Amino acid sequence: GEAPNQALLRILKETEFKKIKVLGSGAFGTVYKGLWIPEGEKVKIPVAIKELRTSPKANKEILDEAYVMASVDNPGNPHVCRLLGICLTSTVQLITQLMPFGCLLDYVREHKDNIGSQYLLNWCVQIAKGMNYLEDRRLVHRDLAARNVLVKTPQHVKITDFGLAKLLGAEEKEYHAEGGKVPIKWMALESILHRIYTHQSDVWSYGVTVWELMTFGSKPYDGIPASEISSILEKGERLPQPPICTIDVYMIMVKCWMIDADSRPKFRELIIEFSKMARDPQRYLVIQGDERMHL
Ligand SMILES: *CCC(=O)Nc1cc(Nc2cc(N3OCC[C@@H]3c3cc(F)cc(F)c3)ncn2)c(OC)cc1N1CCC(N2CCN(C3CC3)CC2)CC1
Protein backbone atom coordinates (compact mmCIF):
# COMPACT_ATOMS: atom_id res chain seq x y z
CA GLY A 1 0.00 0.00 0.00
CA GLU A 2 1.60 3.24 1.18
CA ALA A 3 4.68 4.16 3.28
CA PRO A 4 5.61 3.76 6.96
CA ASN A 5 5.25 7.09 8.72
CA GLN A 6 7.08 5.78 11.82
CA ALA A 7 6.36 9.09 13.53
CA LEU A 8 7.17 8.33 17.14
CA LEU A 9 5.46 9.09 20.43
CA ARG A 10 7.56 9.42 23.57
CA ILE A 11 6.36 8.08 26.91
CA LEU A 12 7.16 9.92 30.10
CA LYS A 13 6.52 9.43 33.79
CA GLU A 14 4.07 11.52 35.86
CA THR A 15 7.30 12.54 37.63
CA GLU A 16 8.93 14.16 34.59
CA PHE A 17 6.24 16.87 34.35
CA LYS A 18 4.44 18.57 37.22
CA LYS A 19 1.34 20.77 36.98
CA ILE A 20 1.72 24.56 37.45
CA LYS A 21 -1.39 26.64 36.60
CA VAL A 22 -4.87 25.72 35.36
CA LEU A 23 -5.21 27.24 31.89
CA GLY A 24 -8.40 26.07 30.18
CA SER A 25 -10.77 23.38 31.43
CA GLY A 26 -14.39 22.22 31.33
CA ALA A 27 -16.76 19.50 30.11
CA PHE A 28 -14.16 17.51 28.23
CA GLY A 29 -10.54 17.30 29.32
CA THR A 30 -9.01 20.05 31.41
CA VAL A 31 -5.61 21.55 30.64
CA TYR A 32 -2.78 22.96 32.75
CA LYS A 33 0.52 24.78 32.26
CA GLY A 34 3.78 23.46 33.62
CA LEU A 35 7.47 22.74 33.26
CA TRP A 36 9.00 19.52 32.00
CA ILE A 37 12.49 18.12 32.54
CA PRO A 38 13.42 15.32 30.12
CA GLU A 39 15.19 12.12 31.15
CA GLY A 40 18.46 12.98 32.84
CA GLU A 41 18.78 16.77 32.99
CA LYS A 42 20.24 19.33 30.56
CA VAL A 43 17.58 22.10 30.71
CA LYS A 44 14.00 22.76 31.87
CA ILE A 45 11.24 23.65 29.38
CA PRO A 46 7.66 24.97 29.69
CA VAL A 47 4.76 22.78 28.64
CA ALA A 48 0.97 22.42 28.63
CA ILE A 49 -0.68 19.21 29.91
CA LYS A 50 -4.15 17.74 29.21
CA GLU A 51 -5.52 15.21 31.74
CA LEU A 52 -9.00 13.71 31.42
CA ARG A 53 -9.75 13.52 35.20
CA THR A 54 -12.24 5.78 34.22
CA SER A 55 -14.69 5.26 31.34
CA PRO A 56 -14.53 3.21 28.12
CA LYS A 57 -16.29 5.95 26.13
CA ALA A 58 -14.04 8.64 27.63
CA ASN A 59 -10.73 6.78 27.28
CA LYS A 60 -11.37 5.52 23.73
CA GLU A 61 -11.75 9.05 22.33
CA ILE A 62 -8.76 10.73 24.00
CA LEU A 63 -6.71 7.89 22.52
CA ASP A 64 -7.59 8.83 18.95
CA GLU A 65 -7.07 12.50 19.86
CA ALA A 66 -3.40 11.84 20.61
CA TYR A 67 -3.03 9.19 17.90
CA VAL A 68 -3.69 11.68 15.09
CA MET A 69 -1.40 14.28 16.67
CA ALA A 70 1.59 11.94 16.26
CA SER A 71 0.57 10.25 13.01
CA VAL A 72 0.94 13.65 11.35
CA ASP A 73 4.27 14.38 13.05
CA ASN A 74 5.92 12.98 9.85
CA PRO A 75 7.99 15.90 8.60
CA GLY A 76 5.56 17.99 10.66
CA ASN A 77 4.35 21.54 10.01
CA PRO A 78 5.30 24.71 11.89
CA HIS A 79 1.61 25.74 11.69
CA VAL A 80 0.47 22.40 13.15
CA CYS A 81 1.10 21.82 16.85
CA ARG A 82 3.27 18.75 17.30
CA LEU A 83 2.67 16.16 20.00
CA LEU A 84 5.39 16.39 22.62
CA GLY A 85 4.77 13.28 24.71
CA ILE A 86 2.31 11.27 26.75
CA CYS A 87 2.13 9.78 30.25
CA LEU A 88 -0.18 6.90 31.26
CA THR A 89 -1.65 7.57 34.69
CA SER A 90 -5.13 6.44 35.76
CA THR A 91 -6.24 9.70 34.17
CA VAL A 92 -4.25 9.71 30.92
CA GLN A 93 -2.26 12.92 30.40
CA LEU A 94 -1.29 14.63 27.11
CA ILE A 95 1.73 16.91 26.70
CA THR A 96 2.31 19.55 23.98
CA GLN A 97 4.52 22.62 23.64
CA LEU A 98 3.24 25.62 25.57
CA MET A 99 2.17 28.63 23.53
CA PRO A 100 2.88 31.61 25.78
CA PHE A 101 0.51 34.18 24.22
CA GLY A 102 -2.62 32.05 24.42
CA CYS A 103 -5.05 31.74 21.53
CA LEU A 104 -6.05 34.00 18.69
CA LEU A 105 -9.52 34.81 20.05
CA ASP A 106 -8.17 35.61 23.51
CA TYR A 107 -5.36 37.55 21.79
CA VAL A 108 -7.34 39.36 19.07
CA ARG A 109 -9.99 40.48 21.57
CA GLU A 110 -7.17 41.93 23.70
CA HIS A 111 -5.75 44.07 20.92
CA LYS A 112 -9.04 44.39 19.05
CA ASP A 113 -7.74 47.53 17.38
CA ASN A 114 -3.99 48.15 16.99
CA ILE A 115 -3.47 44.96 14.98
CA GLY A 116 -1.49 45.23 11.78
CA SER A 117 -2.88 44.97 8.29
CA GLN A 118 -0.08 42.47 7.67
CA TYR A 119 -0.51 40.47 10.87
CA LEU A 120 -4.15 39.76 10.03
CA LEU A 121 -3.24 38.75 6.47
CA ASN A 122 -0.24 36.63 7.53
CA TRP A 123 -2.34 34.57 9.95
CA CYS A 124 -4.64 33.69 7.06
CA VAL A 125 -1.59 32.55 5.11
CA GLN A 126 -0.35 30.66 8.17
CA ILE A 127 -3.60 28.93 9.13
CA ALA A 128 -4.14 28.01 5.46
CA LYS A 129 -0.60 26.65 5.04
CA GLY A 130 -1.03 24.40 8.07
CA MET A 131 -4.43 23.12 6.95
CA ASN A 132 -2.85 22.26 3.59
CA TYR A 133 -0.53 19.86 5.42
CA LEU A 134 -3.54 18.38 7.21
CA GLU A 135 -5.38 18.14 3.89
CA ASP A 136 -2.32 16.44 2.39
CA ARG A 137 -2.17 13.86 5.20
CA ARG A 138 -5.84 13.04 4.47
CA LEU A 139 -6.97 14.51 7.80
CA VAL A 140 -10.03 16.65 8.49
CA HIS A 141 -10.20 18.80 11.61
CA ARG A 142 -13.91 19.68 11.79
CA ASP A 143 -13.31 21.93 14.82
CA LEU A 144 -11.37 24.79 13.24
CA ALA A 145 -11.96 28.17 14.89
CA ALA A 146 -10.08 31.08 16.42
CA ARG A 147 -10.51 29.43 19.82
CA ASN A 148 -8.43 26.53 18.48
CA VAL A 149 -5.59 28.64 17.04
CA LEU A 150 -2.67 29.48 19.33
CA VAL A 151 0.10 32.09 19.07
CA LYS A 152 3.72 31.13 19.75
CA THR A 153 4.84 34.63 18.74
CA PRO A 154 2.65 37.55 17.64
CA GLN A 155 3.71 36.55 14.10
CA HIS A 156 3.33 32.78 14.58
CA VAL A 157 0.08 30.85 14.86
CA LYS A 158 -0.59 27.10 15.00
CA ILE A 159 -3.56 24.73 14.99
CA THR A 160 -4.36 22.36 17.87
CA ASP A 161 -7.22 20.54 19.66
CA PHE A 162 -7.52 17.62 17.24
CA GLY A 163 -10.11 16.36 19.71
CA LEU A 164 -12.80 15.86 17.08
CA ALA A 165 -10.36 14.96 14.28
CA LYS A 166 -10.63 11.90 12.04
CA LEU A 167 -8.25 10.50 9.43
CA LEU A 168 -9.79 10.00 6.00
CA GLY A 169 -8.25 6.95 4.36
CA ALA A 170 -7.92 5.96 0.74
CA GLU A 171 -11.17 6.20 -1.24
CA GLU A 172 -13.85 7.34 1.29
CA LYS A 173 -14.05 11.10 0.60
CA GLU A 174 -16.34 11.81 3.61
CA TYR A 175 -17.01 10.73 7.18
CA HIS A 176 -19.88 10.34 9.67
CA ALA A 177 -19.63 10.10 13.44
CA GLU A 178 -21.30 11.00 16.74
CA GLY A 179 -24.68 12.58 16.08
CA GLY A 180 -23.74 15.29 18.55
CA LYS A 181 -20.99 17.04 20.52
CA VAL A 182 -20.33 19.48 17.66
CA PRO A 183 -19.66 23.24 17.20
CA ILE A 184 -22.67 24.22 15.11
CA LYS A 185 -21.73 27.85 14.31
CA TRP A 186 -18.42 26.97 12.63
CA MET A 187 -20.09 24.10 10.74
CA ALA A 188 -21.17 23.59 7.13
CA LEU A 189 -24.75 22.95 6.06
CA GLU A 190 -23.59 19.81 4.24
CA SER A 191 -22.52 18.60 7.70
CA ILE A 192 -25.20 20.11 9.95
CA LEU A 193 -27.87 18.44 7.81
CA HIS A 194 -26.31 15.14 6.69
CA ARG A 195 -23.54 14.54 9.25
CA ILE A 196 -21.09 14.26 6.34
CA TYR A 197 -17.63 15.78 6.58
CA THR A 198 -15.42 16.45 3.57
CA HIS A 199 -12.20 18.42 3.41
CA GLN A 200 -14.53 21.11 2.06
CA SER A 201 -16.48 21.12 5.33
CA ASP A 202 -13.30 22.50 6.94
CA VAL A 203 -13.04 25.18 4.23
CA TRP A 204 -16.31 26.48 5.66
CA SER A 205 -14.70 26.76 9.10
CA TYR A 206 -11.75 28.69 7.64
CA GLY A 207 -14.14 31.39 6.45
CA VAL A 208 -15.72 31.65 9.89
CA THR A 209 -12.25 31.68 11.51
CA VAL A 210 -10.81 34.54 9.43
CA TRP A 211 -14.15 36.30 9.92
CA GLU A 212 -13.47 36.08 13.67
CA LEU A 213 -10.04 37.66 13.21
CA MET A 214 -11.26 40.48 10.96
CA THR A 215 -14.26 41.18 13.22
CA PHE A 216 -11.70 41.32 16.06
CA GLY A 217 -12.90 38.28 17.94
CA SER A 218 -16.64 38.73 17.52
CA LYS A 219 -19.05 35.85 18.04
CA PRO A 220 -20.54 34.40 14.83
CA TYR A 221 -24.34 34.54 14.81
CA ASP A 222 -24.47 36.22 18.23
CA GLY A 223 -27.83 35.50 19.79
CA ILE A 224 -28.82 33.35 16.81
CA PRO A 225 -29.89 30.09 18.50
CA ALA A 226 -27.96 27.01 17.42
CA SER A 227 -31.30 25.35 16.59
CA GLU A 228 -31.71 27.63 13.56
CA ILE A 229 -28.34 27.71 11.75
CA SER A 230 -29.77 24.98 9.51
CA SER A 231 -32.58 27.33 8.45
CA ILE A 232 -30.75 30.68 8.41
CA LEU A 233 -27.99 29.11 6.29
CA GLU A 234 -30.36 27.52 3.77
CA LYS A 235 -32.33 30.79 3.74
CA GLY A 236 -29.23 32.57 2.46
CA GLU A 237 -27.90 34.58 5.40
CA ARG A 238 -24.17 34.44 6.08
CA LEU A 239 -21.80 36.32 8.32
CA PRO A 240 -21.82 39.97 7.10
CA GLN A 241 -18.82 41.71 5.62
CA PRO A 242 -16.20 42.65 8.23
CA PRO A 243 -15.61 46.41 8.40
CA ILE A 244 -11.91 46.36 7.47
CA CYS A 245 -12.43 43.89 4.61
CA THR A 246 -12.50 44.76 0.91
CA ILE A 247 -14.88 43.01 -1.43
CA ASP A 248 -11.83 40.96 -2.38
CA VAL A 249 -11.38 39.52 1.12
CA TYR A 250 -15.06 39.13 2.02
CA MET A 251 -15.61 37.56 -1.42
CA ILE A 252 -13.36 34.72 -0.28
CA MET A 253 -15.35 34.28 2.94
CA VAL A 254 -18.53 34.20 0.85
CA LYS A 255 -17.10 31.72 -1.66
CA CYS A 256 -16.24 29.41 1.24
CA TRP A 257 -19.74 29.68 2.70
CA MET A 258 -21.38 28.54 -0.53
CA ILE A 259 -23.70 25.56 -0.14
CA ASP A 260 -22.04 23.41 -2.78
CA ALA A 261 -18.85 22.37 -1.01
CA ASP A 262 -17.53 21.42 -4.46
CA SER A 263 -17.45 25.05 -5.65
CA ARG A 264 -15.78 26.06 -2.40
CA PRO A 265 -12.10 27.03 -2.59
CA LYS A 266 -9.22 24.65 -1.98
CA PHE A 267 -6.59 25.35 0.67
CA ARG A 268 -3.72 25.58 -1.84
CA GLU A 269 -5.45 28.54 -3.52
CA LEU A 270 -6.01 30.16 -0.11
CA ILE A 271 -2.27 30.21 0.61
CA ILE A 272 -1.46 31.80 -2.76
CA GLU A 273 -4.44 34.17 -2.78
CA PHE A 274 -3.61 35.30 0.77
CA SER A 275 0.18 35.26 0.27
CA LYS A 276 -0.32 37.83 -2.50
CA MET A 277 -2.41 40.10 -0.26
CA ALA A 278 0.35 39.94 2.36
CA ARG A 279 2.63 41.81 -0.06
CA ASP A 280 0.28 44.84 -0.01
CA PRO A 281 -1.83 44.88 3.17
CA GLN A 282 -3.00 48.49 2.86
CA ARG A 283 -4.70 47.82 -0.50
CA TYR A 284 -6.74 44.84 0.74
CA LEU A 285 -7.61 45.82 4.33
CA VAL A 286 -8.92 49.18 5.53
CA ILE A 287 -7.44 49.38 9.03
CA GLN A 288 -8.21 52.58 10.94
CA GLY A 289 -4.62 53.77 11.09
CA ASP A 290 -1.60 51.75 10.03
CA GLU A 291 2.00 52.54 10.98
CA ARG A 292 2.51 49.48 13.23
CA MET A 293 5.46 50.63 15.38
CA HIS A 294 5.94 49.74 19.05
CA LEU A 295 3.58 49.39 22.04
C1 LIG B 1 -8.29 30.04 23.33
C2 LIG B 1 -8.28 29.61 24.79
C3 LIG B 1 -6.86 29.21 25.25
O4 LIG B 1 -6.47 28.12 24.99
N5 LIG B 1 -6.03 30.20 25.98
C6 LIG B 1 -4.64 29.93 26.47
C7 LIG B 1 -3.71 29.22 25.69
C8 LIG B 1 -2.41 28.96 26.19
N9 LIG B 1 -1.41 28.25 25.37
C10 LIG B 1 -1.46 26.85 24.94
C11 LIG B 1 -2.65 26.15 24.70
C12 LIG B 1 -2.53 24.82 24.29
N13 LIG B 1 -3.70 23.98 24.01
O14 LIG B 1 -5.07 23.96 24.78
C15 LIG B 1 -5.90 22.86 24.10
C16 LIG B 1 -5.25 22.58 23.01
C17 LIG B 1 -3.69 22.87 23.36
C18 LIG B 1 -3.19 21.69 24.25
C19 LIG B 1 -3.08 20.42 23.70
C20 LIG B 1 -2.65 19.38 24.51
F21 LIG B 1 -2.53 18.13 23.98
C22 LIG B 1 -2.33 19.56 25.85
C23 LIG B 1 -2.45 20.82 26.41
F24 LIG B 1 -2.14 21.00 27.73
C25 LIG B 1 -2.88 21.88 25.61
N26 LIG B 1 -1.33 24.28 24.14
C27 LIG B 1 -0.23 24.98 24.37
N28 LIG B 1 -0.30 26.24 24.76
C29 LIG B 1 -2.05 29.42 27.47
O30 LIG B 1 -0.75 29.17 27.95
C31 LIG B 1 -0.09 30.34 28.38
C32 LIG B 1 -2.98 30.13 28.25
C33 LIG B 1 -4.27 30.38 27.76
N34 LIG B 1 -5.26 31.11 28.58
C35 LIG B 1 -5.62 32.59 28.31
C36 LIG B 1 -6.28 33.28 29.52
C37 LIG B 1 -7.45 32.52 29.97
N38 LIG B 1 -8.05 32.86 31.09
C39 LIG B 1 -7.66 34.08 31.61
C40 LIG B 1 -8.69 34.71 32.56
N41 LIG B 1 -9.99 34.75 32.08
C42 LIG B 1 -10.84 34.33 32.96
C43 LIG B 1 -11.66 35.50 33.53
C44 LIG B 1 -11.16 34.40 34.47
C45 LIG B 1 -10.16 34.08 30.90
C46 LIG B 1 -9.41 32.73 30.91
C47 LIG B 1 -7.13 31.13 30.31
C48 LIG B 1 -6.51 30.39 29.12
Q: Which domains does the chain have, with CATH numbers?
A: 10-97 (3.30.200.20), 104-284 (1.10.510.10)
Contact 216, 115 (CB under 8 A): yes
- Nearest atom, ligand 1, residue 149 CA: 1
User: Is the minimum distance from the CB of 98 to ligand 1 under 6 angstroms?
Assistant: yes
Which structural technique was applied?
Answer: X-ray
- Nearest atom, ligand 1, residue 69 CA: 21
User: Is the minimum distance from the CB of 50 to ligand 1 under 6 angstroms?
Assistant: yes
- Declared resolution, Å: 3.5
